[PDB]
Amino acid sequence: MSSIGTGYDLSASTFSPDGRVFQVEYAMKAVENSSTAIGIRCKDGVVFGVEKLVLSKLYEEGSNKRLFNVDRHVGMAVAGLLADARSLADIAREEASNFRSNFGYNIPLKHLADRVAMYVHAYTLYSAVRPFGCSFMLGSYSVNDGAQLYMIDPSGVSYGYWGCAIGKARQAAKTEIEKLQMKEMTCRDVVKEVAKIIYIVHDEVKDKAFELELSWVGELTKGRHEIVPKDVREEAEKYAKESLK
Amino acid sequence: TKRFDSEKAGDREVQRTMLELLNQLDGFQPNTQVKVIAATNRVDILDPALLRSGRLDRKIEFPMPNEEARARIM
Amino acid sequence: DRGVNTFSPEGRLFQVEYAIEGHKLGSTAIGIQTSEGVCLAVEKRITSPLMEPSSIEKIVEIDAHIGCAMSGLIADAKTLIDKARVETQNHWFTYNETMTVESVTQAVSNLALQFGEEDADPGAMSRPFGVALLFGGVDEKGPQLFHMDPSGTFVQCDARAIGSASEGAQSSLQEVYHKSTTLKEAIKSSLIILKQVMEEKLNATNIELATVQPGQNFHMFTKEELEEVIKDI
Amino acid sequence: NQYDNDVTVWSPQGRIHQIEYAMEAVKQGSATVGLKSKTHAVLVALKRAQSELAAHQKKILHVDNHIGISIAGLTADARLLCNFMRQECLDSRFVFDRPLPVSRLVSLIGSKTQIPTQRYGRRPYGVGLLIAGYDDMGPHVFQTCPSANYFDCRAMSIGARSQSARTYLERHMSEFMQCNLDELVKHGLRALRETLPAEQDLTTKNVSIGIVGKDLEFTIYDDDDVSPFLDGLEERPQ
Amino acid sequence: MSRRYDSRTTIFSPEGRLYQVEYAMEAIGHAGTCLGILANDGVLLAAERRNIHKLLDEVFFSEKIYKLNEDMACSVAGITSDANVLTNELRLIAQRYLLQYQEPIPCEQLVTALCDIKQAYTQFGGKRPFGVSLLYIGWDKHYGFQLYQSDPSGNYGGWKATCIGNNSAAAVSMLKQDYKEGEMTLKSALALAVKVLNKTMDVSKLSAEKVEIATLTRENGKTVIRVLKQKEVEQLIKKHEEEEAKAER
Amino acid sequence: MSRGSSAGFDRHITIFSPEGRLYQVEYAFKAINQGGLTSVAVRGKDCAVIVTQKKVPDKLLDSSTVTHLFKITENIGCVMTGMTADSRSQVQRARYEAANWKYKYGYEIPVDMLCKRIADISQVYTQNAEMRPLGCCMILIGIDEEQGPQVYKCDPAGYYCGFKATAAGVKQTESTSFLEKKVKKKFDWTFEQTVETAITCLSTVLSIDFKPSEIEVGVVTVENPKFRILTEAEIDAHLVALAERD
Amino acid sequence: GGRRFSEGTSADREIQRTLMELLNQMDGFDTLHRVKMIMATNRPDTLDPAL
Amino acid sequence: MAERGYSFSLTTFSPSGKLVQIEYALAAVAGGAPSVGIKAANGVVLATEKKQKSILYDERSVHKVEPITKHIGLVYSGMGPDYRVLVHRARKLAQQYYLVYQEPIPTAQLVQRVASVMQEYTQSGGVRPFGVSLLICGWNEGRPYLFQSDPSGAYFAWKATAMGKNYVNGKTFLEKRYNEDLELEDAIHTAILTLKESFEGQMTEDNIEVGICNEAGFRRLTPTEVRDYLAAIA
Amino acid sequence: TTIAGVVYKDGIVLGADTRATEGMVVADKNCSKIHFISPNIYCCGAGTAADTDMTTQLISSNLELHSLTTGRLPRVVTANRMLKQMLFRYQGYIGAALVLGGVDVTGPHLYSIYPHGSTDKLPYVTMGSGSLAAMAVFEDKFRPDMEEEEAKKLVSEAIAAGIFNDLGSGSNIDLCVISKSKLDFLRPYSVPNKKGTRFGRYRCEKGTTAVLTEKVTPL
Amino acid sequence: MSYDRAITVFSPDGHLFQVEYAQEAVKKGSTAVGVRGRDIVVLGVEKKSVAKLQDERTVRKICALDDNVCMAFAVVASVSGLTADARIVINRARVECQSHRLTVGDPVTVEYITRYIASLKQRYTQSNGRRPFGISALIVGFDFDGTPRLYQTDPSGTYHAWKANAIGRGAKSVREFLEKNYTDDAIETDDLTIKLVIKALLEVVQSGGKNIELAVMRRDQPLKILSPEEIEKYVAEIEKEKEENE
């Protein structure tokens, strides 16, 4: 089963009489271990809220960051193992960069998501390599394709979501989204909401301690994936803290 | 662990006990009077007949201690 | 089953721990850096007089002013030495002067650990070599003795021993051999230490000595020279 | 166990034990401390050798005219990775001709290290690297794991019994930021000594320093100017 | 995963044999009689035709007699499957040699090119060795008439008379008993070969459906490779059969 | 040994069993059932139809870009049943090949050329012991030029074959046998008629009973050169007629 | 619900006697009437081929 | 998209001296559809069962009976997917030959080519052999021809052969019913009878496919023509 | 050199050609068929340089075969155009082949003329070989641009006969190839315009002008 | 290639398995003796297993790598000739000898071939999915000097020159009898060197001239492989000399 020397977790070419693939499933349990990364689609952009894990006492900003820029206007928030996430960042950024060069217009998220998923999926099929141990979101704003949110898991699926969570708290965190009307809503108000969801979900045993990182890609940034200002972070932090009490 | 089709043997002292254990969890006799705190190292080894959501209701995973948790243990 | 590639809870690889043991199996070689030059001594340890003692070699030339004594599996080392010969003259084409002890040793050591038993290229190792090499010469910089390990850890030495007596001999060298001991005395120090691992007494057909001294190229000592150090041990 | 037969072997938790077990190899390595100010990036390292009657070969490696590394772990593997980095740094100097970013270089190591850990029938590399580099955005001192994740720290210690040294790093964490070159090196020595027992206090011989910064390029002091930093002794601060 | 499945049959054994070659060696023995005898004006091969039905097309010259070149011919003991890929490859090699040298290829030169390939499979790769052992017959300028045998790793031996297949020990001993190193002519040489095949084989009168015999004869300075037809074979059967009849008396 | 070849390798990697056909290959057909999707496809003379769940599970999942009807290319479209990961992977590979064919070869792509091309590829995947026999099944619609509207389905095993009627999914056997009774008591296929047959089979078998927002129907019509989803308007008009049917 | 067995422990042996008895009682020469017998299983695959 | 492949020993010899995989592949073809090939010596006739056990299959262009080229065809028994790649591959060899010579590939030549493929699948590891037995037909160079290639990579010559279920009985019924120096008409009649002796029972013209091969070419007849034949046979 | 035309009519496609196949302006052979029959569905006329045209038709025929069998659609002339354009590019625009591909799809019969250019050329009715414009020019002239099938078949045969008369390169029989997508009627003698004079009288000789000193059969 | 499965992996015993498995396979049998003379070097193998019906002219167990380099081989089992295994080493060595003579105008020395054997064994070790040959070769030849040499290699790839050595069926036993026979006269007289090879082979098992094949090389002249008829005359004369000394 999990303790074995042939097939099961060694392979992923294996099937059980149920049909399952255990290795691809073990990769899914790996994304679960670290804290939540949420990314919410607005009709005007994407706002992310990520727990940025504080693994030491001698931190500087951007240390073990999970916010990546795939393209100029795509942000990528990862959850689960960061080792696998760095290799995934290089592959996604590379597919986007060449796209911009050739097509000369802003990469459609629907296209980018299909290509990275195929890559994850090529590894899950194979028993020759293991598959990535993280799950990620790509989120973007353009006026050539609209605001899009996509999610790619360790299996190799790409489907669009209008508000998603990956990481430990995601079953709880997702529920809070159904409460919110977020499909139509400014990116300014949604930052306040991603921050308050994270503060309440966190507990001292999903991970020791975190640093709040929120990111913009919307009408406010003018279609640029950038990190939120010091001002923005703090008011959204404040509202999270006041709601927490 | 019931995945049986075992055309040759397969023990089945163990089969009888696996089925009897379900029966006692079922509401022929109460299950609001008997609670089961179950500890098993893996759920991979275990079969879904046992796990369900009306044999074992909560599924609580235990990750290995965090950094703060080990200082508390000490 | 478990693989061999895996790290153990000790915090070391299995293949590599075996390779160090391979170094321990063979014959002992002593390489002493003196500031008058660098001498390399190795035991022949012949068991038959029908052999021709010249052609039992375990000192082979990396360069024309660097000599190398090698220990553990004699065969496994030879490949590393073959690749070394091509680099030293190659170095002459590019730089327009001869290779140093330091440059050659770091380049062979990169190859020493590369191992991936399955799903690794056939132009790359499946297992590491169990050889320890002692590169001893005097070059543009001066007398240098560098030691190379099968773990691919290179370090500069003045007196190093490798082979069956490797830990024992190395301790014993640190004691007699210092930089207040001359080159001929280094040759006497090596001969005494050599005997426990040897099956017989020291002779001029049971040692092979070669010294590379300043201002001179590599010289393989002749029967007369071997015999003068045999007289006084 | 059989969560670590190959580096594709998952545990039910969802962790590869071989990559973790590769970190235990870094602990076998020699103690190295990485510190930064606002003008210098300083690397303080422990050199060990088998002959102490001979000069100890450096544990500080050359990567760029403003990048130097200190290794903790596997010696062959650290050198093996070093060559990929060296090729890229020197290439970056030809093409881009900036003083290359520590954050940029480090991610490329993350793609290569991932290859064997992703691949069956192979071993991870069990070496932890502390890189000092100075670009035009000031110093950065980065830690790279046996995995592929990086930390941008102000101070870090990976190596043998690194906890003892961190106790010092935690205590003067504020101080690092203000320093000049001299001050960075004295703190790293006071940290470095702690890893080792109470009754062992360093010598210049087994200390190599790689100094990087705004006022300087790349200079490695093996005993050259090591003696004044060592002075002003402090012996194992608890 | 992958090594565990690999039974390590590619490993050397302490004794100094390869497990695979030894298991292939048995595959040759199950299978039918293939014998070659040397004679002094030509050389002949006799192989067991194992395709007997009353509805046979005969789309090939034979399914065991293969003409590899326009100066070589061979017979088979082993598995028909291995024999088919192999037989084609034997043709490109025989034919290229014929282009360069322009003289008939030695029987020894022909076994060696293949040998590398056989050896390659066994030692490494985890690839099966070919299940057939081939008796090549030919005439080459240098030695005159020759017969060569190849084995499952390409181990070669020059033989005046040899036999592999079913009741290999019985056929080779018997043939050793009457004939020792090239004491007979081409005429008599066909009569011994059919006689041996007769005893070894379950049908003890044979027909031309049971045996197929091929001759390679040097005529007017040039090697002629001919598979003899059923008609010629019956004549050879009656000659041995009659010789057996006298023996009893 | 009984209960799978665990002392043997035959479900561990691809190699023939002592019983003939592989455990692993048979097992792949079991992965389809996991998806939760059941597709019913009915062949007509007006359109070749696919009826599949539009069904969404939350407010958080799109339905403006999540569909299991896929436009491989304009004339030919398909539905994937089973594992979602494998589903996308074949669709993209199919899309690229479809453009490449049209560009080089210049021939318009019928139902057969996509179906057969994928099927041969999915044979290679079954044949290699690195790759796994597919987790999805592809049911294609598209207009054959000689035949008319055609419905083909290719196996994760690597076999392609034509169908007048087919079904794939959780209830593969139950739906095909149900649809068999409908063929036997034959319907002269109009536009409305092929669509009606497909929905009644699926509604009876799942026993949910669908409404128009819960299904999405895919047609490739003889006057539409492109693949189009009929959506709710046409479905409701048929839907009521289904209750009045029998 | 039994299987072929016949390399098993004493536990696989007792199951068969009972499994034999059920067969004859249903259809053998003995059979039910108005009265109905209901079985409950988890797998129909654990069952004897004859059953 | 990162793999080297695996090649491992389950494809090397067992101690018995026979190959573990070949026996299993022969078992796959025995489980298949029965298929007879008869060389008339007036044309080659090949018959197979059209059915796949549900007759909700369109098959007016999808057939078990496929022409490779102008007058050479393959009929198979055994595995459907494995056959599909072999049909496609066989064509590709035929056209390659067609470019150089101008004549379509002989049945004698074609089998060796196909045989190499069957061989790779057995001998290398991490693959498994094809489980399809092939009846290869042609009429070329003044004689009609029938070849057999079994799954291992052997090719055998027969003038009347039977396959699949009750391959043994078909060969004996062929021996008995069909005699030598009879015509083409007689050949066509005997094949449908061998299929009756090889899985018995009910036949429709959508349960059988019959294809006739001449130098005019191989063609699989239309559903109607096959229907007339049925009535003749018992 | 060669004079080939194929036509789109109100029926199917009629190809007309003179016999002779020439290596330049001189005849290599005065026998065989210039318009070639391939598979049952595809007929191709050939024109310009001989060496480039025969081989192009042959190579595309394999490719087209693979595509026909798998797809199970009948061959499309637009499809045929793309394959010749891609193949001829691969070669690097070496030699001169004006090629006339003509096949019947399930829709109308479709005819295309591909010159050696590697163009995507759609005609209306075309004639090839020689000069592309010069042959094409005739179609505008005699065809009213659609007339009944029988009238059109006499018309092509008459126009092609005029090019044979005007240009003596074409010689021997004029062949008409009536091409459907399974029916290939190869009518050798649509019109014979010219033929030789009988080679009745010898130029033979007895040995006394050249003799033989051997008659043997080697072994 | 795809095969990278382990056949050799390093031991804590400080050895390579294959090499040791090979070394015992030369302990257990296939007597090959070589002596080095003063004009001529002669190597001999005993066994081609001439059972009085086999050919003797065309069989080679001593193969000429070059015209001044020759090797005689051994390693045996139940699969008795490992001629195949040798045949690879023989072909690669043959090209390499010739190749060395094109580049470097000195005639190739035995010392070059011996390093080349040490690297072939090793290279097979380092490459994934590959295994060392079992052979041990007695490399005979002539240098630039024209000096006769006899060198011996082991299955690991370590070489030594030796005046006279015997391997097979007790390497040390055959060599210690042969040690008395190696005298100053024996090495000087060429004819006595031919007898020395034959005289050693006879110790293990006596008689047979067909079983014994030996090849002789004189100066840089081509290899001459002696007729068995020459051997039979020689064994008869050797047997009487044994009675004379003793």
Tell me the CATH architecture of domain F2-245: 4-Layer Sandwich (3.60)
Tokens in use for J199? 């005289």
- Separation in Å, CA of E45 to nearest CA in chain H: 21
Distance of alpha carbon J25 from alpha carbon J28, whole angstroms: 5
CATH superfamily of A7-245: Aminohydrolase, N-terminal nucleophile (Ntn) domain (3.60.20.10)
D54-58, Cβ contacts within 8 angstroms, sequence gap of 24 or more? D54/C33, D54/C145, D54/C156, D54/C157, D54/C158, D54/C159, D55/C156, D55/D205, D55/D222, D56/C155, D56/C156, D56/D205, D56/D206, D56/D208, D56/D222, D57/C154, D57/C155, D57/C156, D58/D208, D58/D220, D58/D222
Q: Which residues of F touch E (CB under 8 A)?
A: 9, 12-13
Q: Is F85 within 8 Å of A155 (Cβ atoms)?
A: yes
Distance of alpha carbon C92 from alpha carbon C85, whole angstroms: 11
Q: Is A15 within 8 Å of D13 (Cβ atoms)?
A: no
Q: Does some domain include residue J244?
A: no
Q: Does some domain include residue I212?
A: no
- Greatest C-alpha distance within chain H: 60
- Nearest CB to I86: which of F104, F108, F144? F104
Angle, helix A109-125 to helix A22-32, in steps of 10 degrees: 130
Full residue range of the structural domain in which residue E236 is found: 19-247
Alpha-carbon A96 to chain mean position? 17
Full residue range of the structural domain in which residue J55 is found: 2-239
Q: Is F220 within 8 Å of F142 (Cβ atoms)?
A: yes
Q: Best of C126, C205, C208 to disrupt the J interface by mutation (most J CBs within 10 Å)?
A: C126
Q: Name the closest residue on chain A to residue B4, using Cα atoms.
A: A17
Per the structure, the count of domains in chain J is 1
Q: Do D55 and C156 touch (CB under 8 A)?
A: yes
Query: DSSP letter string over chain C?
Result: ---SSSBPTTSSBHHHHHHHHHHHHS--EEEEE-SS-EEEEEE---S-SSB-GGG---EEESSSSEEEEEESSHHHHHHHHHHHHHHHHHHHHHHSSPPPHHHHHHHHHHHHS---SSSS-TTS-SS----EEEEEEE-SS-EEEEEE-TT--EEEESEEEESTTHHHHHHHHHHH-STTS-HHHHHHHHHHHHTTTSSS---TTSEEEEEE-TTS--EEPPHHHHHHHHH--
Q: Is D154 within 8 Å of A60 (Cβ atoms)?
A: yes
Segment (H or E) for D208? strand D207-213
Distance of alpha carbon C180 from alpha carbon C1, whole angstroms: 55
Beta strands in chain J (DSSP E): 32-36, 40-46, 62-64, 69-74, 136-142, 148-153, 159-161, 164-167, 212-218, 224-225
Instruction: Give the bridge partners for A80, in sequence order.
Output: A134
Counted residue by residue, chain D has a size of 238
Full residue range of the structural domain in which residue I59 is found: 1-197
Instruction: Give the bridge partners for I154, in sequence order.
Output: none
Query: DSSP letter string over J179-220?
Result: HHH--HHHHHSHHHHHHHHHHHHHHHS---SSSEEEEEEETT
CATH label of the domain that carries residue I83: 3.60.20.10
Q: Name the closest residue on chain B to residue G15, using Cα atoms.
A: B12
3-class secondary structure, F33: helix
Q: Is E212 within 8 Å of E62 (Cβ atoms)?
A: yes
Beta strands in A91-155 (DSSP E): 134-140, 148-152
Distance of alpha carbon H25 from alpha carbon J227, whole angstroms: 52
3-class secondary structure, J108: coil
Tell the burial category of F228 from Cβ atoms under 10 Å away from its Cβ (0-12, 13-18, 19+).
Answer: middle
Q: Is A147 within 8 Å of A43 (Cβ atoms)?
A: yes
Q: Does some domain include residue J232?
A: yes
For D201, other C-beta atoms within 10 Å of its C-beta total: 14
Per the structure, the count of domains in chain E is 1
- Separation in Å, CA of F156 to nearest CA in chain A: 13
Three-point CA angle D18, D24, D25, nearest 5°:
95
- Method by which the coordinates were obtained: cryo-EM
Q: Does some domain include residue J245?
A: no
- For residue A167, which phi and psi values (nearest 5 degrees)? 120, -175
The verdict on H6 touching A (C-beta cutoff 8 Å) is yes
Based on DSSP, count helices (H) and strands (E) in chain F, helices before strands. 6, 10
Instruction: Give the bridge partners for H156, in sequence order.
Output: H148
CATH label of the domain that carries residue J51: 3.60.20.10
Alpha-carbon A123 to chain mean position? 20
- Nearest CB to I65: which of H61, H88, H95? H95
Distance of alpha carbon A114 from alpha carbon F85, whole angstroms: 10
What contacts B14, CB < 8 A, 6 or more positions away?
none
Tokens in use for D25? 């190899």
Instruction: Give the bridge partners for J212, in sequence order.
Output: J46
Per the structure, the count of domains in chain C is 1
Q: Residue D204 carries which DSSP code? A: G
3-class secondary structure, I112: strand
Domain ranges of chain F: 2-245
Q: Which residues of I are catalytic?
A: 1
- Nearest CB to B5: which of G7, G15, G45? G45
Distance of alpha carbon H5 from alpha carbon E78, whole angstroms: 30
Q: Which chains touch A (3 or more CB pairs under 8 A)?
A: B, C, D, E, F, H
Q: Dihedral through CA I178, CA I180, CA I185, CA I191, nearest 10?
A: 0
Q: Do I72 and H61 touch (CB under 8 A)?
A: yes
Residues of B in contact with F1 (CB under 8 A): 8
Distance (Å) of CA J99 to CA C78, F100, I118, I159, J152: 21, 49, 50, 71, 22
Per the structure, the count of domains in chain I is 1
Residues of C in contact with E2 (CB under 8 A): 118
Q: Which domains does chain H have, with CATH numbers?
A: 4-232 (3.60.20.10)
The verdict on F13 touching H (C-beta cutoff 8 Å) is yes
Domain ranges of chain A: 7-245
Radius of gyration over alpha carbons of chain J, in Å? 18
Tell the burial category of E35 from Cβ atoms under 10 Å away from its Cβ (0-12, 13-18, 19+).
Answer: buried
Euclidean distance between the first and final Cα of chain G, in Å? 8
- For residue J76, which phi and psi values (nearest 5 degrees)? -140, 165
Q: Does some domain include residue I214?
A: no
Residues of D in contact with B44 (CB under 8 A): 12
- Greatest C-alpha distance within chain J: 64
CATH label of the domain that carries residue E49: 3.60.20.10
Distance of alpha carbon A153 from alpha carbon A166, whole angstroms: 9
Distance of alpha carbon J233 from alpha carbon J246, whole angstroms: 21
Q: Does some domain include residue J246?
A: no
Q: Do A205 and B45 touch (CB under 8 A)?
A: no
A 160-179: CB under 8 A from D: none
Q: Is C46 within 8 Å of D58 (Cβ atoms)?
A: no
Alpha-carbon D197 to chain mean position? 21
The verdict on D71 touching C (C-beta cutoff 8 Å) is no
The verdict on A19 touching B (C-beta cutoff 8 Å) is no
Closest among F158, F155, F36, F157 to F166, alpha carbons compared: F155
Residues of H in contact with E5 (CB under 8 A): 6, 8-10
Closest among E148, E185, E155 to E41, alpha carbons compared: E185
Q: Do H4 and A128 touch (CB under 8 A)?
A: yes
Distance of alpha carbon D80 from alpha carbon D66, whole angstroms: 20
Instruction: Give the bridge partners for E37, in sequence order.
Output: E44, E161
Distance of alpha carbon D95 from alpha carbon D109, whole angstroms: 19
The verdict on J5 touching H (C-beta cutoff 8 Å) is yes
Three-point CA angle H184, H186, H189, nearest 5°:
115
